[PDB]
A paper describes a structure:
The conserved [name] p97 (Cdc48 in yeast) and adaptors mediate diverse cellular processes through unfolding polyubiquitinated proteins and extracting them from macromolecular assemblies and membranes for disaggregation and degradation. p97/Cdc48 forms a ring-shaped homo-hexamer, with each protomer containing an N-terminal (N) domain, two tandem [name] (D1 and D2) domains, and a C-terminal extension (CTE). The D1 and D2 domains form two stacked hexameric rings with a central pore. Both D1 and D2 domains can hydrolyze ATP, but only the [name] activity of D2 domains is critical for substrate unfolding.
Using the same dataset, we determined five structures of p97 in total: three SH conformations (I, II, and III), and two DH conformations (I and II). The pore loops of the D2 domain are relatively flexible and not well-resolved in p97 SH conformers I and II, which represent [name]-inactivated states. In both DH conformers, the D1 ring is in an [name]-activated conformation, and the ATP-binding mode is essentially identical to that of SH conformer I. The nucleotide-binding mode of the D2 ring in the DH is different from that in the SH. Notably, R766 in the CTE no longer inserts into the ATP-binding pocket of the adjacent protomer as seen in the SH. The D2 ring in p97 DH also has a substantially wider pore than that in the SH, likely stemming from differences in inter-subunit interactions in the SH and DH.
Numbering used by the authors:
A (entry chain F): 12 to 348
B (entry chain A): 12 to 769
C (entry chain B): 349 to 464
D (entry chain F): 465 to 696
E (entry chain B): 581 to 769
Write the structure that this text describes.
Amino acid sequence: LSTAILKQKNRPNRLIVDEAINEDNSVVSLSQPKMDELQLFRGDTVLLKGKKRREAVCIVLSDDTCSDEKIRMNRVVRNNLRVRLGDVISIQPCPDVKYGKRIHVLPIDDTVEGITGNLFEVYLKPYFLEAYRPIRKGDIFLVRGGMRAVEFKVVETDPSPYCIVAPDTVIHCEGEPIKREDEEESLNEVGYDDIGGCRKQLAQIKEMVELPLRHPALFKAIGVKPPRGILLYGPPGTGKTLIARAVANETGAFFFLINGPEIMSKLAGESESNLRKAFEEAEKNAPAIIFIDELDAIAPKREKTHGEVERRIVSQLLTLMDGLKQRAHVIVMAATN
Amino acid sequence: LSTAILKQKNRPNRLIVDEAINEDNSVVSLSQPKMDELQLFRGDTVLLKGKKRREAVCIVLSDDTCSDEKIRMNRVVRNNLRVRLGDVISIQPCPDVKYGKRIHVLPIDDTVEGITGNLFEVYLKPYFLEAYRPIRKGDIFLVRGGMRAVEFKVVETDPSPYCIVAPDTVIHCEGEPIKREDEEESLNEVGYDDIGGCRKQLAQIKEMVELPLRHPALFKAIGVKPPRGILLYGPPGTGKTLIARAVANETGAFFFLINGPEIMSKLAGESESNLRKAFEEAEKNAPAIIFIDELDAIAPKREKTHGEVERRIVSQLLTLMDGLKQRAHVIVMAATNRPNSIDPALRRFGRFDREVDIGIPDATGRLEILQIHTKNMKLADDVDLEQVANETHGHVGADLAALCSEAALQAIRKKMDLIDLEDETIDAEVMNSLAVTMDDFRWALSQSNPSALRETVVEVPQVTWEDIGGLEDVKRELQELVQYPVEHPDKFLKFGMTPSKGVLFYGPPGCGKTLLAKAIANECQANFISIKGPELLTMWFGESEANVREIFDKARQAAPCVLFFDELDSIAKARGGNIGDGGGAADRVINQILTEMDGMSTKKNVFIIGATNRPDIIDPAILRPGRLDQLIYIPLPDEKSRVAILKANLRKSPVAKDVDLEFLAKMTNGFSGADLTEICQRACKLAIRESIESEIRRERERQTNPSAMEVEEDDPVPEIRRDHFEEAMRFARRSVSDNDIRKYEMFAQTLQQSRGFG
Amino acid sequence: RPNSIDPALRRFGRFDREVDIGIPDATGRLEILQIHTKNMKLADDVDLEQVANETHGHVGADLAALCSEAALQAIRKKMDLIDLEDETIDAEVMNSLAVTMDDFRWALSQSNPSAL
Amino acid sequence: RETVVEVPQVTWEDIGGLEDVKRELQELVQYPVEHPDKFLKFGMTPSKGVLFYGPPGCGKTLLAKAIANECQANFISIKGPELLTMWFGESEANVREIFDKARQAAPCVLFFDELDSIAKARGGNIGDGGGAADRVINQILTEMDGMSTKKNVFIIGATNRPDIIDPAILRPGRLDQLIYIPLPDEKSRVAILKANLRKSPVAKDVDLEFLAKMTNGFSGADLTEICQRACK
Amino acid sequence: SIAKARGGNIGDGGGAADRVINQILTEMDGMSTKKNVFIIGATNRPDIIDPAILRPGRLDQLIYIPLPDEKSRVAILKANLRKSPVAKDVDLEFLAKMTNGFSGADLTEICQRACKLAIRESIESEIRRERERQTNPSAMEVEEDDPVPEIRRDHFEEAMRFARRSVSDNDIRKYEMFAQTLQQSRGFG
Ligand SMILES: Nc1ncnc2c1ncn2[C@@H]1O[C@H](COP(=O)(O)OP(=O)(O)OP(O)(O)=S)[C@@H](O)[C@H]1O
Ligand SMILES: Nc1ncnc2c1ncn2[C@@H]1O[C@H](COP(=O)(O)OP(=O)(O)OP(O)(O)=S)[C@@H](O)[C@H]1O
Ligand SMILES: Nc1ncnc2c1ncn2[C@@H]1O[C@H](COP(=O)(O)OP(=O)(O)OP(O)(O)=S)[C@@H](O)[C@H]1O
Ligand SMILES: Nc1ncnc2c1ncn2[C@@H]1O[C@H](COP(=O)(O)OP(=O)(O)OP(O)(O)=S)[C@@H](O)[C@H]1O
Ligand SMILES: [Mg+2]
Ligand SMILES: [Mg+2]
Ligand SMILES: [Mg+2]
Ligand SMILES: [Mg+2]
C-alpha cells in the first residue's frame, strides 16, 4: 500500500478511447445504457478531462454500436486531450450553457502559405453558420474550406471554460497567424509519463504535496499538521528539475519557481526583494507551491560564506520560512545535489 | 521542596467545576454556607479567574443542592475560562459595578450563513432587554433567537474589566462578522498544560522569573538581588520556544520577543535600532520580559565573526545588557542550542549567569508528551501508549510529534480505496471511520529515524540487584563504599575519615562487571553516565581538549551520579601497546582523565568506577591514593554462582519442570556468564525452529485436504521442555583458557606493586 | 586577558606598571562573606569561618551568588504561607525570615565555582 | 564512483557446497523478518552479526549476496581498500555516511569485506607500535553499538587473516556468530565445477568426478581458473 | 610521567632528554640569584631521569628518601590518628612491628580501614535500636546514650588481615643501588 495513491480507480464514468470512423470533429460514441446511466440526454454537452489539465467539450450522440467500456473519437480530440490510444478519460455532464459575445480564431501560417486567398468567406463561413459547435479556449480544429489542412486556434474569448458558439457570435479574422514551432514546442510539456524509474518516490511526493492541498479537511479532521518543506536530493543528472516541472504541469495549484543562480546573480538588495516578492505572491494567491531550485547556491554553510550579503540572504530565507502558518496553504520544496 | 512552587494551595475560595443543568448562560451553583462564608449576598457579581489569564463574571444564585467543594456551570463559561472538567477556578467578590456607555457585539459568520434575515430585532432584542446580563470584553455567548446556534462576540467596549449592561446601553449590529478559524486558532494557545517531561525545570524558571516580578518586596527585604539573565539550552527540538510562549501567555508581565534571524536579516544600521527599541519599550513599560530566541545567531565567538557589522551588534548587546539596573524590573532570557558558540563575554557575572538545562526526556517524559499530542486524535481501543513510550529510545519532543503524524497518515493510506484524489469532497462516514490502531504506531515506529541517538544518556538505570547472580560480597562492599556517604554524612565527621571516590573492577572477560555498576546506581537512586574507550578515541582527534572536560562537567552538573568508565584496554592498547612500544604506560586520554579527577571537590557526590580486562598494560599513574583506590578483582563464577546466573537469564522465557540447572552448571567449568547466556539463547533459537516447522506442517496438511479444514488446533509448543539444552551443551566452547586464569590470579594477588619499577 | 593586549601598549611610558588582583585565600573569603551578609538577617547558628574554609575555588562574585542562593532556600522553606497568587505578603512572614546553616550547606552543595 | 544499493542477482544455485551454512544463515536472517512474534513468545532478542573467516578463495562473498537475494533485501558492499581511501581527506564522515545510508535503505545486509587490509595497514604483520584495535575499526564498533533493533539492518563480515583481527570486534552485541568456512570436499568440488560450467557448452566425454579427485587443496578460484583455461 | 611519556620504559627512539624538561632546564638557567625562588623536585623512577637535569647550577642536592624504620612507623601512625579518637587498649608498637615493607600510604590505608569498620558497627547498631523502637512503639522509653564514641581495639586486627605490601624487595634493592650512585649517570649509559 506504499504506492496505493498511484492507482487509477476505475469508475462507471471512465471511458477508454478507440478509433472513430466519423470525420466530423464534434462526435463521441456512447452506448444507450451509458446515456441512460449518467442521464445524458441526446444533444448534451459533456465536459471531457484528459491529461496535463487539458479539457474538451463535444455534443453527445447515441452511437449504439459502441461498447459500454470504451469511447470513440478522432485525432483532433485526442490531440486536444493529450492522450494516446488506450488511455482513460473522465466524462462529466456539464450542461451549464451560456453563449459567447466575441470569439477570436487565429490560423497557423505554414498551412496558410502556399495560397491564402480570402480567409473569412472561404474558410470561416460554411463551418460556423448554423452549427452551434462548442469550443474551449485553446482548441485546434480543422476546416476543409481551402486547399488542404488549414487549422485554426481560438485564443481570445470571454467565456473561459467553454461556450456553444451561436451564429450571432462575432467572428474575426484580422489577427496574426501562429507558427508551427509555437505549437510543437508546447506539445513537449512534461507529465507523469515522462518520468521513468522513480515510482516509489512519486508515491511519496503525491502523498506529501498533492493530498494536503486538495483535501485540507482530512488533515484537519484526523488531527495532523501537514509538512511545510520537502527536500529532494540525489546525484547530478537524476531528474529533480524534471519532477519539478511535472508537478508544475499537473498539480492544479499556483506554481512559482526560484532559481539559485538567478537570485544570486543580481545586485545587493535586489535579491532579497525577489525572495520577498516570491513569498508574497504565493501567499496572496491560491494554494501554492514554491520550488527553490539549487538551494545550495543561495544557502551554504556559514563557515564557507565570506560575504555580508550572502549571510543576509540566508537569514532572509530563514525568516520567510518561519512566517508560513497553517492558515496559509503554502508548500515549499527545494532541490539540491 | 525543589518543586514546591508548583503546588496549587487549596483555599476556602477554591471551586472545582461540575456539570450544570441550567441552560441559562449566567448561572453559578453555590451552597448557602459558601455565600454566607464569602459574604456573597444574593445577586452579587463575582470575578471568576481561570487559565491563561481568561476571566469571566456571572450573577450569583443560591443553588443549595450544590456541594461546598464544587461549582456547576455550562459549556459557555468553561470555554470562556479555558478549563476542563475537574479544574480549580478562583472566585473573587468584586461588586464594583459601573454601567457601560456603548457595547459592540459581532457575530460569527459561518452560523450566520444559511439564513441571516434581520440580525438586530430577531437576535439582539429578547436577550438584552431587561436582563442586566454582565459581559467581559471578549466573551462568546449564545442566543437562540434564530435558526440554530448563532454566537456573538463583544469586541469594542469602554468598560474594560467588565460591566452590567443596562437596557439603555447602546447596542449595535453594523459591524463585520468573525470567521470560525479566527477563534479556533486562538483556542490553540499554550499554557503550562502543554509542556510534558519538564517539571523540574519549570520549577526553576518560576522561581527565577515569576517570583521576582510579582513580589519585589521579599527580595528587597531579605537582601537579595534577583538575576538579570537566564540562558536555556538543550539539543534541537526539546521545547525551548514552547516554554517561551508558555511564559508569554501566563506571566502577567509585558512580553517582547526578539528573533535571531529577523535581526540579522536587516540592513546595516537598522538592526541596532531594533535592539535599542526593544530595550527602550521594555524599560518604558511594566515589569517586563525580553526573550531573545536563537542567541547564537546574533552573537557568536569573535574568532568566527568576520564582519565589522556583526562585531558591532555583539558590542551593542553587551552595552544594552549592562544598562539594566535594579530599579528597572526587567528580566532578559535567551535560548540557544549551541551553548559553547556564544561569545564568552556574555556568560559572565551580571549578564547571563544563570543557566537552565532543558534535556532529552526519559520514558516517563515520553509518555506525557505522547498523551499531550494525541488528545485530538481518535485512538482505537488497541493503542497502549506505554509500549510506544518504552520503544522510542532516542526521540525528543518533535520526533514524537512526527511519530503521531506518520501514524495517522498510515491510517489514511489503509482507507484509500474509498478516498478519491480526483473528486471534490469526501463522504462524512469516511471522515468518521478514521481511528488509529496499534498497527499504525508500529509502522510509524518502524520508519522513524530519530535525532538524539548520538547523545549521552543520563538517566537512572533499570537493572536491579536481581538481574545479577552471584557476587554477594562485592554487593556488601559496594553498598558500604557508595551509599553511606550519601545517607549518613555526619558519621564520617564523628571520626576523621574522608570517604574515597574510586573503585576499579578488573578480571577476565564476561564475568559481569557492567551490571554491578548499573545496579548500585539503581540502589542509590543516582544518575548514571557511561563512557567507553572506543567512544573516547573517536571524537578526540577532531576536538583535542574539550571532550573529557565536557564529560566531567556534565557529571558534576547532574550530581549525585556514578560516572562509569569502561573498556580501558582499548586506550591502553591503542596508546600503550601490546608488548610495549615507543608509547608510554601513561596515555594521553588517561592523562587528561587523571588531571580532571584530581581537581574534583568532595562536597560533590560524584563517584567514579572503572573496569578493564587487561590489567597488565594499565597505567601505574591511575592507581595512587586520591584516585581509583579500592581494587576489586572479579573472578570466574563458582558452580552455585553458575546456578544463580542460569536462574537469572531464564526469567523472561517459560521453561518446563523437566530441566535440571545443577547438572547443567556441573558440566561447565571455565564458562562465564556470557557463555551461559549463549547456551540459553541457543536453546530458545532451537525451540523457535521447531515451532515454525510445526506450523508449516499444519498449513501444508490443511492445504492437502482444504475441503474440510476442521482441525481447530491449539498451540503445539508453549515452553521449552528439555533436550534443547543437551544440543546447546554440545555446541558450547570455552571462552578463557587455564593459562589465562592463572595469569589473572597472579595479577589478582599483586597489582598494586606495579607503581615502581616494571 | 593580560596577554591579548597589543604589546605596543605595555612598553615604557604607556602601561608600564602592573598590579595583580588575584584569587583570595581563606582569610580573604571570610572578609568578603562578612561584607556581603551585613544586610541579611542571620540566625545564631551560622558560623562564617566554616563556610570560608569549605569554599575552595570561589572568587568574590561566587560568594555573592552563594549568599543569594542561601536566602532563596530560606524562602522556599517558607512556601506554604507565601502565595504567588495574592497581592502582598504578611509582615510576620517578612519578619520570620532568617537564614540558617542548613541553607548555607544547601547553597554550598549546589555551587559550581569558576576558578577551579 | 558511487555506492550501489540494489537487490543482487546471485541465487543459491551459483554456489556449490556449503549447505549447512545455508541452513544456518536462513535461520539467522530470514526468521526475524518473517516471524517477529515468535521471538516475543520466548524472551530472545535476535542477534545482528555474523563473521565468516577462513582460507582465501573459499566462497564467502557469494553467500552474503545469496542470502540477500533470498530475503529480497538491499545489499551494500564495503571493502577495506575503499575505506582506507577517502578517509584521509574526510576523517570522520565516511563511516557515519555508510551506516546512515544502510539505515535509510532498510531492510538490508551490510557486508563488510577484506578486513585484513585495515588490520595489516594499522595492526601490522608481526605486530608493531600500532594496536590490535584500529582507528577505522574503532569507529565501526562505535557505529555498531548505537544501532536500534527496530531496524532490520544485518551486518556480515569477512576476513582471511584471523590472527591480527581486533579482539574488540568480537563481544556479545556485535559480530557474534563465528562461522569458519573451510576448503571444499570432493563432492563440494564436483558441485563447484558444475556451477562454473553452466554458461559454456561442454560435451558428454568429460568426467568431473575424476577431475575433482585430481585436485586436493584447490579452492573454488582454482577450479574456476581451470575452466577458464579450458575455454581459452 | 614526563620521563615515561617521552623517554620511555626500556628506552625507545625518544631521548633521555625530554622536550618539556628541556624547556624547564632553559628556564632554570636564566634565573637571577637576587630572587629567592627555590626549586624542589621529586620522582620515584630515578633510572629514566634526564642526565641534563643533574649538573651544578641546577638541581644539585640529591636526597634519597627511604622506606621508614619501625620508630618512624610508630611516628607515622601517631601522625595519622590525631583526628579520630581512639581508646587506650591499642598498641602501636606491635602494630609497627607487624609491618615490614609498608610505607606511609599503607599505614594510612590501615587507619582508614579501621575507621570504616567502626562506622559500619555504628550504623548497624542504630538500625537495631530503631527496629526495637518499632517493635514496641507503645512505650518508647529507652532514651539511650551514644553506643560508640571511639575505636576500642580489634578493628586494627581485621585491618591487619586486609593489608598487602606495596613495594617488593627486588625493587628495594634496586632503589638502594640507585641510592648510592645516581650522579654517575651523566657520562655514558
Ligand atoms: N528518471 C528520468 N526519466 C526520464 N528522463 C530523465 C530522468 N532522469 C533524467 N532524465 C533526463 O535527464 C535530463 C536532465 O535531467 P535534469 O532534471 O536536468 O537533472 P537534474 O535533476 O536537474 O540534476 P542537476 O543537479 O540539476 S545537474 C532531463 O532533461 C531528462 O531528459
Ligand atoms: N516537552 C514538550 N512537550 C510538548 N510538546 C513538545 C515538547 N518538546 C517539544 N514539543 C513539540 O515540539 C515542537 C517543536 O519544538 P520547538 O519548541 O520548536 O523546539 P525548539 O526548542 O524551538 O528547538 P529549536 O532549537 O528552536 S529547533 C513543538 O511545537 C511541540 O509540538
Ligand atoms: N552475574 C551475572 N548475572 C547475570 N548475567 C551475567 C552475570 N555475569 C555476566 N552476565 C552476562 O554477561 C553478559 C555480558 O555482561 P558484561 O558485564 O557486560 O560483561 P563484561 O564484564 O563487560 O565483559 P565484556 O568485555 O563486556 S564480554 C551479559 O549477557 C550479562 O547478562
Ligand atoms: N562454492 C562456490 N561456488 C561457486 N563459485 C565459487 C565457490 N567458492 C568460490 N567460488 C569462486 O571463487 C571466486 C572468488 O569468490 P570469492 O568468494 O569472492 O572469494 P573470496 O572468498 O572473497 O576470497 P578472495 O580473497 O576474494 S580470492 C569466484 O570466481 C567464485 O565463482
Ligand atoms: Mg536541475
Ligand atoms: Mg526555537
Ligand atoms: Mg561491558
Ligand atoms: Mg571477496
